[PDB]
Design a protein around this ligand. Structure first.
Ligand SMILES: Cc1ncc(COP(=O)(O)O)c(CNN2CCN(C3=C(F)CC4=C(O)C(C(=O)[O-])=CN5C4=C3OC[C@@H]5C)CC2)c1O
Ligand SMILES: Cc1ncc(COP(=O)(O)O)c(CNN2CCN(C3=C(F)CC4=C(O)C(C(=O)[O-])=CN5C4=C3OC[C@@H]5C)CC2)c1O
Lengths: 412, 412
């Protein structure tokens, strides 16, 4: 717990800038900006108002890690939900820290870039989010698939993958033990599957034994259909080995590009220093919109909002499941998603569905997404389809599945 | 040209993503988003309204390269202002293209990352923007400093540096010829100096002869006090070797994080692929704000706005020079700024200004910035101070230079 062995020479080289009447600053005059006030309504909520001075702040440069009121609020959220062991540690031993990012993707991308040298080994479970595979591809790592099933990563397959390395080689710089394990523990995209609490503990003990980081990409954390959320990897992180990406895109707004990253201070500080020379900071304006909403909501309002969105997505899930039962019984296999917005469907008797969907189905005015995109080798044939239930009506799902069943029959 | 010479292994490896009733999409339902309408007022202009449908768009994911209306408007802007030779070249030659970025610093950071292998040579004039120095340092390039004066880079210094290679070394992959020249041609930060039209021609000829890219970082372009703007490198780009970064930060809003990158289509494509796996897209809400303003203003509003802001900063410039003349003529030297928001002051007495500006000027009442931050070797002593004239009244300035004027007189 220095973290040096985890990171690249470029990342380690990064330095903070060498930076009443102030003539020392580089702020444009915000009085020159054309936008003067703003009012944003909130459904059954307090309107967000930027008066004259607040608008000038919204339209001006702000701190790289995020605005202070949003960072304190998010720190208290993390403490209440996850009580990470790491809040009481010194900085060097991995004290809990946070930064607002321009979506959770930015956080992840910056973390991957911080850590990966050409040839490094990284573990994850395929099928995996494609934006992650596309981020990892040009970095030259070996991606090693860990087996999974309806309950996520199978600790026993991780265990036997890891048995090719020696635990004592972890801190040897000339031995290529894995740098991290990446997973989406709730509502994995594309499969819909979630990790159980017993599996998490087992995986955490492995990460400690072989001494690698866990990158917990958890954008569907607040979209769990049975409304009991099991402990996160961050909540059990006695070692300071977890970096966690949370997203507001699925519950508050995707277009505002605001997410946040939580983890060991030294690693968060590397990410912040990279952000500082790229985007500089997240939109000051969008941070304030969100900070205002959250502060006025408090616990009462936030819980109520997330309950309503969970209730919406589980009605949708019940609908797509009804439609799959009606049309696809005996033609395909699927598990009930625990969270998220996707159903993952294995078509029986066909080796690759990409012919059938990317071509035949679209003539019929319907498309779902073939599973090839979610593998490291997307050229391999895949019998799977991802179907989203975020938007389609009960009626649209029915026709969509009616059409798919037709195609599967004709193809056979 | 083909551009492969100037692109890293990692950047060349980037691929576009893989991925009518459609269940194929990964969009969250925007009806779940809590913000519902927005009203933004514009000084002496049309109030901007986001009604319920428009708000939904503003709060949702959008294209990586930028929203189509902002793109088409920006392209017509560049054509109108710079009429670049490359608009009708085939893609592989440098066909002009453009993408919106999350500030102009994101554009520059991604261009540097796309190009630099450790050990590469890049050319630039010091003192230079601290943010580009901080971005370049971790990439492990050799920064070769090119000499400059009140008219910017001196071509003859550039000619001498380039004499260490033969013109024919450029396409020889075994020779480490420079990848690019970086400069800020108008109101350099910190110096306030600008390039003349005559030097730009001589510099472009050297870039052609030794075949390197020019990166035109031009955030202060619309802030030219000499209310006739000098032709840009982009406007003379017969070879498709220029990448230009423009910013709305000084004229519209720094906190909204909206800038644009213009240059050869194959390089623009490499930058868009990198943004797809990091920020995904610039905030859709902030793009819509800007694009409504710009389309409502048209060209009469837009040039009327810049005229008004030039006039403001021009007055601030006169005020600060009048204050530098009144209290400083003798103790320090300075050039008159051609554009931007900074005055660069050489204090004549001492080797390092950090003595009397940090410990001794903070314990007075004024702040200026030690010139140390703007050199590759920021530890080396600097007699220079950067003073901004964006904000402070004639009043405050008068006192600020009064205080400084005394502080100088005590250490002599
Ligand atoms: C020559 C040159 N080239 C590119 C850019 C980048 O412009 P964008 O289009 O906005 O990406 C610039 C502009 N450089 N500015 C200099 C000023 N700088 C910062 C401030 F003015 C203020 C500031 C704060 O107040 C602050 C805080 O509240 O803690 C933090 N920071 C601030 C600045 O940058 C560092 C951090 C984020 C912004 C960039 C250019 O001149
Ligand atoms: C498992 C997992 N992990 C992290 C993230 C990161 O999300 P953040 O929003 O950064 O917090 C995700 C989310 N993945 N989504 C998948 C879907 N994808 C895009 C769309 F859904 C829709 C979309 C459009 O409609 C669109 C347009 O209208 O032009 C453009 N684009 C769209 C997507 O991305 C590509 C471009 C921007 C975004 C990320 C996750 O699942």
């Amino acid at each position: 717990e220095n973290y040096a062995r985890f990171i690249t020479a470029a990342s380690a080289a990064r330095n903070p800038s060498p930076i009443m009447i102030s003539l020392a600053g580089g702020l444009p005059n915000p009085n020159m900006f054309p936008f003067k006030t703003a009012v944003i309504t909130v459904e059954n909520g307090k309107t967000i108002q930027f008066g004259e001075e607040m608008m000038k702040r919204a339209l001006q440069y702000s701190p790289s890690a995020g605005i202070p009121e949003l960072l304190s609020w998010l720190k208290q959220l993390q403490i209440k939900l996850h009580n990470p062991p790491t809040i009481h540690y010194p900085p060097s031993q991995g004290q809990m820290d946070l930064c607002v990012t321009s979506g959770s993707q930015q956080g992840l991308c910056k973390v991957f870039e911080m850590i990966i040298n050409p040839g490094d080994n990284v573990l994850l479970d395929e099928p995996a989010y494609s934006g992650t595979l596309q981020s990892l591809h040009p970095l030259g790592c070996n991606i090693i698939n860990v087996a999974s099933d309806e309950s996520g990563i199978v600790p026993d397959s991780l265990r036997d993958i890891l048995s090719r390395w020696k635990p004592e080689d972890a801190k040897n710089p000339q031995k290529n033990t894995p740098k991290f394990l990446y997973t989406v523990p709730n509502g994995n995209n594309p499969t819909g599957n979630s990790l159980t609490s017993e599996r998490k503990k087992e995986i955490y003990e492995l990460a400690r034994k072989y001494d690698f980081l866990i990158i917990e990409d958890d954008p569907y954390y607040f979209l769990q259909f049975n409304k009991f959320r099991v402990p996160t990897f961050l909540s059990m992180d006695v070692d300071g080995r977890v970096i966690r990406a949370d997203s507001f895109s699925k519950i508050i707004s995707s277009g505002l590009r605001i997410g946040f990253l939580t983890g060991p201070k030294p690693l968060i500080e590397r990410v912040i220093l990279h952000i500082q020379v790229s985007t500089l900071h997240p939109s000051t304006f969008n941070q304030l919109m969100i900070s205002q909403l959250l502060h006025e909501w408090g616990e009462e309002g936030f819980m109520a909002h997330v309950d309503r969105v969970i209730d919406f997505y589980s009605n949708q899930k019940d609908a797509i499941l009804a439609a799959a039962d009606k049309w696809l019984t005996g033609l395909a296999e699927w598990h009930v998603p625990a969270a998220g917005m996707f159903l993952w469907i294995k078509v029986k008797g066909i080796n690759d569905v990409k012919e059938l969907i990317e071509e035949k189905a679209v003539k019929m005015g319907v498309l779902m997404l073939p599973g090839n995109a979610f593998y490291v080798d997307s050229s391999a044939p895949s019998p799977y389809l991802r179907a989203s239930f975020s938007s389609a009506s009960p009626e649209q799902m029915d026709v969509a599945f009616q059409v798919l069943a037709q195609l599967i029959k004709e193809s056979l």
